[PDB]
Design a protein around this nucleic acid. Sequence first.
DNA 1: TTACCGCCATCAATATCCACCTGCAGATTCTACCAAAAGTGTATTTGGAAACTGCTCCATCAAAAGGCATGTTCAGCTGAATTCAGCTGAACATGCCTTTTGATGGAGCAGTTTCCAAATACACTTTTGGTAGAATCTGCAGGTGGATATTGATGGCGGTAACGG
DNA 2: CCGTTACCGCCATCAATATCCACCTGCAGATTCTACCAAAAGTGTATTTGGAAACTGCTCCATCAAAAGGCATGTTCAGCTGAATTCAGCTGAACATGCCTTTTGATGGAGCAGTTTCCAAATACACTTTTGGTAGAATCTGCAGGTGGATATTGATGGCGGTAA
Lengths: 99, 98, 517, 105, 106, 94, 94, 91, 84
Amino acid sequence: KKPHRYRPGTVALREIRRYQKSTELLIRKLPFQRLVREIAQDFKTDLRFQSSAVMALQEACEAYLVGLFEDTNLCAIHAKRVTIMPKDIQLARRIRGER
Amino acid sequence: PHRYRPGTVALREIRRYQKSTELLIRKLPFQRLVREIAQDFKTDLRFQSSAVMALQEACEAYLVGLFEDTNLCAIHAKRVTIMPKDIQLARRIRGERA
Amino acid sequence: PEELRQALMPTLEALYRQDPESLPFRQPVDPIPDYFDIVKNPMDLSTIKRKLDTGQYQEPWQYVDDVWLMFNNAWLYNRKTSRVYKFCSKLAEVFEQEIDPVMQSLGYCCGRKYEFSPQTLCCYGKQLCTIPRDAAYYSYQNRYHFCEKCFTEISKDQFEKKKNDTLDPEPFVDCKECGRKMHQICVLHYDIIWPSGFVCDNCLKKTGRPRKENKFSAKRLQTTRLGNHLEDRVNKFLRRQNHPEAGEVFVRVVASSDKTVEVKPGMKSRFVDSGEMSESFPYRTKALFAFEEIDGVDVCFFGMHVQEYGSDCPPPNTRRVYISYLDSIHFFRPRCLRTAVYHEILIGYLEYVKKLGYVTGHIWACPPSEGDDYIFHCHPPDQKIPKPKRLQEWYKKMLDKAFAERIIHDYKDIFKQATEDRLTSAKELPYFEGDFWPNVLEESIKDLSQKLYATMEKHKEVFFVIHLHDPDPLLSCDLMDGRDAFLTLARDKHWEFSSLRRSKWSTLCMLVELHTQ
Amino acid sequence: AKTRSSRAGLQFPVGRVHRLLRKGNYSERVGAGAPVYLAAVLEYLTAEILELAGNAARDNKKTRIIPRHLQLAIRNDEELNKLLGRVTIAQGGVLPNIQAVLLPK
Amino acid sequence: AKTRSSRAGLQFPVGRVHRLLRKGNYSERVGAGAPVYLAAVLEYLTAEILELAGNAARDNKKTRIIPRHLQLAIRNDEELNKLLGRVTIAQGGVLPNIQAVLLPKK
Amino acid sequence: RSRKESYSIYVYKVLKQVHPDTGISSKAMGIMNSFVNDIFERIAGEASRLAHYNKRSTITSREIQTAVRLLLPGELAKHAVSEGTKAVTKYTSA
Amino acid sequence: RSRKESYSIYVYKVLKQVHPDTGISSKAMGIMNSFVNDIFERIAGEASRLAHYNKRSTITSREIQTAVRLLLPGELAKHAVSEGTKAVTKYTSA
Amino acid sequence: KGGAKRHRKVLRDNIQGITKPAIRRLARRGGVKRISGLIYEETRGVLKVFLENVIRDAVTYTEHAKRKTVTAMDVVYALKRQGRTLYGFGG
Amino acid sequence: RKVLRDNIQGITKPAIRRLARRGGVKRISGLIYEETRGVLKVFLENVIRDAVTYTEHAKRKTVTAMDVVYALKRQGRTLYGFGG
DNA sequence: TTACCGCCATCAATATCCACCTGCAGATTCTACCAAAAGTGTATTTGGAAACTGCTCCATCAAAAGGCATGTTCAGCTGAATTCAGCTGAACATGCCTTTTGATGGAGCAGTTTCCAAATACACTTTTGGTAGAATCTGCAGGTGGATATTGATGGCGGTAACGG
DNA sequence: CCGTTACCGCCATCAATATCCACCTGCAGATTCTACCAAAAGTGTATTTGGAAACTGCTCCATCAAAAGGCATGTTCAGCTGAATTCAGCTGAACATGCCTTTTGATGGAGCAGTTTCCAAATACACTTTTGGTAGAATCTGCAGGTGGATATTGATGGCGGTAA
């Protein structure tokens, strides 16, 4: 009988506030560790990793992704939009000059 | 009277100034601006000609890069005319502002 | 064996190439002690590979049947949420994408093991009772079906106890020249149309003989003024849109019969026995359909059932039209203009009935129930049935577009119609056959005015009343004299509309049946 | 008799800074007052960031400085943010900031 | 009477690289082969950039290398452009580049 | 088990000068130590660059002042210069 | 006048090796001098940082090789390391 | 079903290991309100690229120290040399 | 010496147009130029001060191209052809 | 039967390419010089190769649990279609002031000599910060009880309006 | 004709929810105290030296003159580009459903580090030779700059074609 349903954006904004007021890691430890191990395998075989090294890599990746995401949000807003699209990511990385 | 449509002469200038490397900012006004800024920071300063030339070349390179970034930003916004919001966004993403 | 191995090896390798989708299926399943209790024929990719290498296949249909039986076993034993089911689904998609060119190189039009989808099981016990999936039932002659609840509520030992999961494989036809076995639906071969036998497309191309013209097309059906007007309007709109994929659309009226609707006993006693309102209302019911020529094949995609109460009908039904049933198939090309073509068809029908002198049109915006078909049997699983609010919005767009063209005067909900007309008795409400209101009146009868007012205020959004201000001869068609006959014949002959090929086959069959009447 | 840090009125180790400058291969020779100046600058910067982090913790109803407090302190001051604009603080998070367009109504 | 630069078969001065490494205050000690290695790397990079500059000058019907040719060479090679992505070449200009949208849209 | 040099107990002392009743976590203290190390590296590198540019083989307080002026922002650089000058004056008169 | 060292003659010799009939302007010569000087400074600084990280007080061919690998991308790095290995082998072979 | 449910299921290639909610949360921390469906994998690729920008350099450090274990200090060096200096892992 | 003022107007409208043409801009709004000038001013304030910090550090009263090169290198705007 | 927008065709106005030819600042060729490096040849010192080995901690594997992956429904985000005010590009007339070539006084950059306060290299004595183990203290992470804006939705009311008897 | 009911819009407010906060309480983590000692750190003495001052040679930095033509400055018209408005396909947001993958804890040995030996390899430094800067004069030479004309580029001029009333 008409179950309660938040409008699109209210839960999104609540998640914005929750994840901007918190500092915990967002990417799960095991998949990121597996990805890092595979990447190291692509460069040098039979490598070992410290827990602190993996934590530092995860923190740096999360911070870089957060910065990229906020840049893409600004880019999408510049185009009179609120949804980021891969062209926003491409323009943000171009202005950053990574490629 | 013969008249070209808007954009044709603009594209001609684009090609001409992308094919050449001559200085685009006049020597004396830029030197006067440099001297004014210097005396604003420190009075009784003297400047080598090579120093002014290097400063102007660096300024021109930074400006052409920033104008390219502004043009990409404007193109992203489905526009062909650059607006100060485009250059502000380019500087903000570059980290020069925020 | 070498030819079959060479043809079929790339598809099996492509299935193997899927990582990790193929990993669980690369070896026979080794028990999960209950695996053998469910899967009676456990089979795997290595089994195909060894059978193909040994030349155990006389012809590729056995190979594809083994592949699909493997997929069925994996889908049956594994639950939907299991990732093994996802692996099997990905393997099935890859096989579907890869198999067709290999068969077309071997001379076959397709490879996929086509099996008829489970039809709607209309239980012969309680009315409007259906048998859902995985629900047990009792069958007689594969024609009379009863659910367990109705069967228990009722010799009973002779009725076979079955489950609503019987997938009937599609039949096969032999080409007279090459001898290859082809799906009857895929090649659209019908013995009535082509008594000389079936010849495959490859044999026709190799021998240079063109395919014989179909003499039972929708174009060759009997034409009517309403159908001609609808066809002309649709074609003119399509030409104005100038879409390259917009093919010619044929509209034909197939049924036109005079009937009478009778007053139910309660309302008859309350208003007819006193002489205040007529005991019956005559009307003319018409059934027409829309056909599109896709790839040179007629496809039936849109048809209505309507009731026309003429000027001779006693009030309040005098000079009225009422939409009793309508149905549509989403395979119309292009998909963007499908809705607009339906719009043009409905607008043309309304314009025709206005020209005939009719005054008010009535539409009930209630979508079909889950698992129920109005006209076209076995709707495709991807065809999302619109919810009542969506259907009401669609009809609102209907009426706005119609009013923009000055064809209609105005449109309202039935509650606004009654309030503005100041109706005081239930006898003034229109009485249509199978309409929702006649049932509500009898239920309320079993004081009446206020109850009708309350129910009308509750259900106004579903009913649309349209203010507007017969040269077509009667057509006797027992098959189209209602929706029950066509739905029964399609169920008895597996004339499904669940896919484009099946829709084409069903359209060809119903065209042949109409022409043979 | 007296440590160089005490003689210069500083808490940071002047001798350790001088030793690190010697071992850092920055120059052939190192002046006497250079380690004192560098230690004073480092101590001033540490005092500034520590007091900012303490203020942030007090505003957050907390008495222990955590990386979140350090991030809040370093980001909310424009000069401190500019100094570490290319620096990521581990477990520090980001400032609460919601775009105007994304706001409802 | 053999120079260490000719001993390694390089044109760049090994002795000058060694002296600059000692003067630059990079470490307390420097190995014997480090200046040879660094001179070889510098010579290879100079050879690559000069080859590309000469090719660019030839494409422009020019036999004298100018900063414009150097910019054309450095910006047309992905690896070299990445090497000097934060470097400005005086009197070099920019590559001719017009976006598709900037072109006429008749 | 070699000792790992760190500014820890010094910075904590500075904390006691600015917030006697406020503590610091281990992760936050590592952040602080990394900050001080990075600033030390930057200032020393800029001083070395200035010494090399002027053909000077000795790094003095003037080089450190120039480095902190070049690196630190306006009021931060001004206050750092004032603190360094005060410390040098105190050390000289000590 | 104090002499100002430059890589002019070496760049000219390399150009003659790669393009016998192609000249180079004075401004382009300055561009190349700044280019080689910047690469020298970058490689030397990377090697110095590498030596400091491993508590190493000597810059050998291995640190220079690793610095070149860190700085030059892909094919440039591979060719540079090949040329450096060949050069050090030839130098130690006499 | 049978077979195994551990160490034999192997799937989710490394780049796909980052779950869709992980990218969603990362965007939420970046303050983005709406996400396109094509962002996730694209972001993954960008994240993918970032690692060859860092880990390889760290590997270049690890090979230089004659070590077979990647340390956090090498990660700090690789991040610093790329202009992404990180604090807290210098112990 | 004369106290120069209002020299930012020397960065003239056709000059900004030419700079944008080199940058690939076909159409320029009227509010770019002045804004661009300000950005240029900021850029000057970013670099020349550092050069002054170099010039003051060398006990010199003349700004050389070498100090400008040092400032650009330390600001991440490395330039070639003027020494260093 | 008249203006109005399209299209493929020619045509006029105009910028571009380009080959050619001349004067010259800049590029390349020698002569001589020469002090700054480069290299060879002993003496001294030491970073580190090499072997053996204790101690970390990292990969591997068990269960417990806090999460993630799919399908459904739909409000609202987005992009195409339309229209239009007005902004800036193209053209042009007028004239402004930047550039070039020239010369000149001198403030100021830099080379050379002298030489001393300051940095360095030990050698010795003193403090002291890093580490290990015991035991006390506590900030705060959740867990439980209200409970509070808060926002979707149910609903009531005022203003517009829309058509009917 | 003005009157009831639907629609747009406002908004006043029962009700489910996440969360700020009022309070708590146990524990991982931070804080306090005693002891040890190699590691730095501070002080003393002789030595070495980088750069301060003192004077001056000298390069180029600043300044004033004059011409005039390359562009700067201002104005006008409209081409068409940026901006505002509608709306409909539809892609993502919110959510219930199901399960499974991740997280936490315990346990062998692959190598991270500590000790010892000793040698190929690195400094320290006094000559001797080669060689990279480089003042100066002379010849060579690629391309700056102007001319002329064949060559694309642009735009809308002649007219042909529906067409729409």
